[PDB]
Amino acid sequence: VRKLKHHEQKLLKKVDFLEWKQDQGHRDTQVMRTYHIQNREDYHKYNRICGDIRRLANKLSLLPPTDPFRRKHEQLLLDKLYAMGVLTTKSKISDLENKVTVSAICRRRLPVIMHRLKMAETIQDAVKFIEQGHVRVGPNLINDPAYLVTRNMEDYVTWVDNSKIKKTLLRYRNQIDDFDF
Amino acid sequence: PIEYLLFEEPTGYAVFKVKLQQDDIGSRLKEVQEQINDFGAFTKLIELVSFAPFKGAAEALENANDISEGLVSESLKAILDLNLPKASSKKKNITLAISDKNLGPSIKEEFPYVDCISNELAQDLIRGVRLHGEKLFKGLQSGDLERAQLGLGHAYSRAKVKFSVQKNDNHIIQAIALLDQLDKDINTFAMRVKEWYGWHFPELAKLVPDNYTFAKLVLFIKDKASLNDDSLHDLAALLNEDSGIAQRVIDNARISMGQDISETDMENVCVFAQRVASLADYRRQLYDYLCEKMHTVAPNLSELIGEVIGARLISHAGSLTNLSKQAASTVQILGAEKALFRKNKGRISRYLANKCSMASRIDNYSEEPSNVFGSVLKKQVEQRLEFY
Amino acid sequence: SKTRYYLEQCIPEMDDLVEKGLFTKNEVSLIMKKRTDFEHRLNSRGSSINDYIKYINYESNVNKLRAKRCKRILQVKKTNSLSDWSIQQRIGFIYQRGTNKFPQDLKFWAMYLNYMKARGNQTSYKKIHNIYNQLLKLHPTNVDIWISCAKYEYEVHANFKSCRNIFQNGLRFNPDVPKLWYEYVKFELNFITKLINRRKVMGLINGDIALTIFDVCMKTLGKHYINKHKGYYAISDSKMNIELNKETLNYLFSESLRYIKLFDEFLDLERDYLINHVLQFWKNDMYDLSLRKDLPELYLKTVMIDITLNIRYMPVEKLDIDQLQLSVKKYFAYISKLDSASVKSLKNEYRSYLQDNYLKKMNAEDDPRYKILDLIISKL
RNA sequence: AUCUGUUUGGUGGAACCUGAUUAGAGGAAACUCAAAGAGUGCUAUGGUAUGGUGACGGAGUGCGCUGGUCAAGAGUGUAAAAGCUUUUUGAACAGAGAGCAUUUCCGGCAGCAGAGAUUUCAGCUGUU
RNA sequence: UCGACGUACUUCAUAGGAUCAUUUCUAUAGGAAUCGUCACUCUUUGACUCUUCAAAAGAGCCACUGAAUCCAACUUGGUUGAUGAGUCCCAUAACCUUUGUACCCCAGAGUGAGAAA
Ligand SMILES: [Mg+2]
């Protein structure tokens, strides 16, 4: 729409064709951009899992502070989330509410971990290498760029043996051994 | 209560009719000021009813003077009479908006039945007509207002200044710039004529060193083979036989080393020699004109030192006004590169420069300078010369 | 929009056409479709006067078609209803809009005046006057307009008084145009000749004013010609001033000569009296130049007219020897005051004038005056 | 020079720190296709919309309106005046198109002759 | 180890004015915006094609039918000149040297009250 004149803007204050309150600030689109999420509904599936954690933490908080049941369950939740890599620290229980976000889960997707391990220059580049069958976790090739990698499984992300990328790494340092390939 | 508007253009007089009257109480409000800028709003206020162009440039200047003096010209009287309706002198009067208040009393005298208005309301309409200009004339032939302003502007300005061609001294600067150019070209072309005919008769260039005489002779003796006693007399008439060149050329043309050039080549030499002849005559004609102009423009300066030397001095300063404004010392160094004014020798030069400075002042600031003061001023220098 | 208002103004007419049966609704639809195009053309940017001309021509053809179906179908010269004058009213309105939008185009103004003059019964003369009042104000300096309304009111209506005031007012704006002077004097001589011919008519059943205009014409025209060719400034050079003075004398001489030719037409007036005033005018020194000394060629023509003045209009049948004797007597008198070169030219012209006008039209054998003229011609 | 090793200019851009940015950063092409911003140009002109519904128009009469000249009246002023004001009246004159009525004629039809390029307008006689 | 006293030290307020927030009005009359689009110039952004840093993967095979590039061959032009190659900073010129000709050896934004006896 053209720029509204003064008298028009006064009579059309709430008119906005591109930003609505139900959009929630386009947080989904922003986060999908940062971590290169290709399925439009992956964010809102993560959001429902975050909501489940936040619902449980709120219910636990309403239990009396010295309750052994409360302390046990909050620790188990902190243990499980830290192991998955969603939570960076286990010290504080308020992290279950403040620091449990969709961005935290997206930050454990295979492309992002490849980027942080410097296996790819960008998350977009990592997605392409996954889709092109260069990446293996353990002995298993993975072409799904939504694979969530736990802390323990981050040790087994590596290139496929006959990958052209692997040969380039070894050729660059003059360490290519054609017996292996 | 404004009903008609008078606007004065460089091209002619325009009369408009006010269709709507703008608000007076709210005159200073912004929206009534903006409508003057907007043509869509303005055109609803006024409309053109008449336009009477001036006959020519002369009439434009006369009406520019009359409008400047707040007088009603015959042309202005005609357009107003044709347009303004007749009304009572007392009961009710047609209203006319005029830019100048001094013009009001004049129009009232000619037309008792029109009341003139020049208040701020009238000025706003006049400002709008000026602002939009030819756009309001609905294509009527108003020429081009910007161009006619330039012509009328110079005319009006000089008429008050009473500028005259007599005060013009740039003719002197042109003449001197041309005169020395002719002195260069006459020599350069004359030298070429010596070379070209030198091939056909090289020794003759030695016989007649003076180039102008050489050109006239070559025009006669086109081919050195042609040698007759009557021809000897005819070339003997050219210049004089005192130098004996008349006998030398006839004897020498008989025995010479010049290789004969084609007829077409000779045609160029005579025509090119003819060319050198024309510039020599034109140069003398221009030289007399410079002498005549110097007396008219700067009789004192010309009489005191001379026409050519004065002309060079004016050109160096760049103008007669520039020469006058200079101090006496600056005038002395103005002619110190060509020695125009030239220990005791320097004292005359310094003395002469001061007198030349005063002579310039008399010439520049007098509408019709005389040579009376130049004569006595030169006489004063002569006494100083004898003393030293 | 303006277009819709103008289209709706057509509806009462188009409804009347259907009612009278002259046009069918489909045909009425086609006419409005073409009008819709034109009204949009006129109300839009980029409209030119050609759009007005086309729309006027189209409406004219519609009127002709309506008139012909009126006789073919209704079998009546007129149907007393709006459709009779609706088109004619509309065409006048297009002309008003065109002239207001484009006052510069003089061709369109001429078309408007011709159209309104042609339907005199429909358009009162007062409406013609309003157009001329508006046109004259927009173009005061176009002499053709001033003559046109001057002519229109003197032939259609014969208001010498109002036709006079037009020339009085026109010359007030354009004193430097010799054509307007020439036409104004032509009207006055026509007014006098019509008056005398009216006087002649009464008897059976029972020019100075022009010269005053000529005299002021000579004065006024010279003044403006000096103002032109001088530009903003006077001419300092004495010689160039004298040249400019000659140009006016030659310019004014040519204009005065045209008036001499103009007098020839009016048989009723004592033209010889009218001509002699012009000759008397040129005897007086003007602008410090004497015709005899500075411009002999013009002076010879002035003498030529004077010598033949009494015999100029005498037919060969009524040729009087005494008048010829007066004519030749004038010729010798000027010779004694003329140089040899001037005398030779005057002698040749005078011989030719007598030979062509009289001798070649005289029978040599039957007229005794032939021998006298031949003897005079030989002696001249 | 198997001398010396600083400066100036180019190439290159480790570490630390600082700032900005981030579905990495760019380039080329155009009578290409879109979505926007700013400025400029254009008589861009109904303050209440053509003269006209035979509900009409034209011609003419009267009324009305306008201009100044003249005469008289009223007021003011004077010893008497002169002079000045007048929304006081009348006369003749010069007008505008700018209002109101007016059926007094015309705009149906035939004939006469005239002006202009078969068509347009003006006039005269008869007739509805 | 804690108290009381003494000493030393850290921290804490509050005002005046304006504007923006009500799909008119944030409370104030001291303020400024109500129009059915026709062109042209400039600017910003985004598509489409191609591409660099700068690579990686190919919905995969056969058949027919067109196109482009590089060699071979042939045909034209070619040492009486193919190809490549800054006219565009005047070689139609600048600068230096020599010679000849004509003038010059006081101050320069010149100074400003002496000179003569
Ligand atoms: Mg506050």
From Swiss-Prot, chain A:
Q: Which GO terms describe its biological process?
A: maturation of SSU-rRNA; ribosomal small subunit biogenesis; rRNA processing
GO MF terms listed in the record are: RNA folding chaperone; rRNA binding; snoRNA binding
- Ranges for domain S4 RNA-binding: 108-174
Q: Name one GO cellular component term.
A: nucleoplasm
- Please give the InterPro entries that the UniProt record associates with this protein: Ribosomal_uS4, Ribosomal_uS4_N, S4_RNA-bd, S4_RNA-bd_sf
What is the annotated localization of this protein?
A: Nucleus, Nucleolus
Record CDD domains: S4
Alphabetized UniProt keyword annotations: Nucleus, Ribonucleoprotein, Ribosome biogenesis, RNA-binding, rRNA processing, rRNA-binding
Q: What is its main location?
A: nucleus
What the record says about family reads: Belongs to the universal ribosomal protein uS4 family.
Explain the purpose of this protein.
Required for the early cleavages at sites A0, A1 and A2 during 18S ribosomal pre-RNA processing.
Its subunit composition reads: Component of a heterotrimeric complex containing IMP3, IMP4 and MPP10. Interacts with MPP10. Component of the ribosomal small subunit (SSU) processome composed of at least 40 protein subunits and snoRNA U3.
Write the protein's name: U3 small nucleolar ribonucleoprotein protein IMP3
What is the organism field in this record?
Saccharomyces cerevisiae (strain ATCC 204508 / S288c)
Gene (name only)? IMP3
From Swiss-Prot, chain B:
The record's Gene Ontology biological-process terms are: box C/D sno(s)RNA 3'-end processing; maturation of SSU-rRNA; rRNA modification; rRNA processing; snoRNA guided rRNA 2'-O-methylation
- Top-level taxonomic group: Eukaryota
Q: Which residues carry this modification: Phosphoserine?
A: S319
Q: Taking the first listed entry, what is the main subcellular location of this protein, grouped into a coarse class? A: nucleus
The reported result of mutating V331A is: Reduced growth rate at all temperatures
Per UniProt, subcellular location reads as: Nucleus, Nucleolus
* Ranges for domain Nop: 297-388
Would the keyword Ribonucleoprotein turn up in this protein's UniProt record? yes
Could you tell me the keywords of this UniProt record? Nucleus, Phosphoprotein, Ribonucleoprotein, Ribosome biogenesis
Q: Which GO terms describe its cellular component?
A: 90S preribosome; box C/D methylation guide snoRNP complex; nucleolus; nucleoplasm; nucleus; small-subunit processome
Write one Gene Ontology MF term.
mRNA binding
The UniProt function text for this chain reads: Required for 60S ribosomal subunit synthesis.
Family listed: Belongs to the NOP5/NOP56 family.
Any further remark recorded for this protein:
Present with 13500 molecules/cell in log phase SD medium.
The UniProt subunit note reads as follows: Interacts with NOP1 and NOP58. Component of the ribosomal small subunit (SSU) processome composed of at least 40 protein subunits and snoRNA U3.
Q: What is this protein called?
A: Nucleolar protein 56
Q: What is the species listed in this Swiss-Prot or TrEMBL entry?
A: Saccharomyces cerevisiae (strain ATCC 204508 / S288c) (Baker's yeast)
The top of its lineage is: Eukaryota, Fungi, Dikarya, Ascomycota, Saccharomycotina
The gene name reads NOP56
UniProtKB/Swiss-Prot annotation, chain C:
Q: Please name the SUPFAM superfamilies in this protein's record.
A: TPR-like (SSF48452)
Query: A Gene Ontology molecular-function term?
Result: snoRNA binding
Q: Which GO terms describe its biological process?
A: endonucleolytic cleavage in 5'-ETS of tricistronic rRNA transcript (SSU-rRNA, 5.8S rRNA, LSU-rRNA); endonucleolytic cleavage in ITS1 to separate SSU-rRNA from 5.8S rRNA and LSU-rRNA from tricistronic rRNA transcript (SSU-rRNA, 5.8S rRNA, LSU-rRNA); endonucleolytic cleavage to generate mature 5'-end of SSU-rRNA from (SSU-rRNA, 5.8S rRNA, LSU-rRNA); maturation of SSU-rRNA; maturation of SSU-rRNA from tricistronic rRNA transcript (SSU-rRNA, 5.8S rRNA, LSU-rRNA)
Q: Does the keyword Ribonucleoprotein apply?
A: yes
Tell me where in or outside the cell this protein is found.
Answer: Nucleus, Nucleolus
Its Gene Ontology cellular component terms are: 90S preribosome; nucleolus; nucleoplasm; Pwp2p-containing subcomplex of 90S preribosome; small-subunit processome
Q: Does the keyword Ion transport apply?
A: no
Further notes on this entry? Present with 7520 molecules/cell in log phase SD medium.
UniProt subunit comment = Component of the ribosomal small subunit (SSU) processome, or 90S pre-ribosomal particle, composed of the 35S pre-rRNA precursor, the U3 snoRNA, and at least 40 protein subunits. Component of the PWP2/UTP-B subcomplex composed of DIP2, PWP2, UTP6, UTP13, UTP18 and UTP21. Interacts with U3 snoRNA. Interacts with MPP10.
The entry's family comment says: Belongs to the UTP6 family.
Name of this chain's protein: U3 small nucleolar RNA-associated protein 6
Native species of this protein?
Saccharomyces cerevisiae (strain ATCC 204508 / S288c)
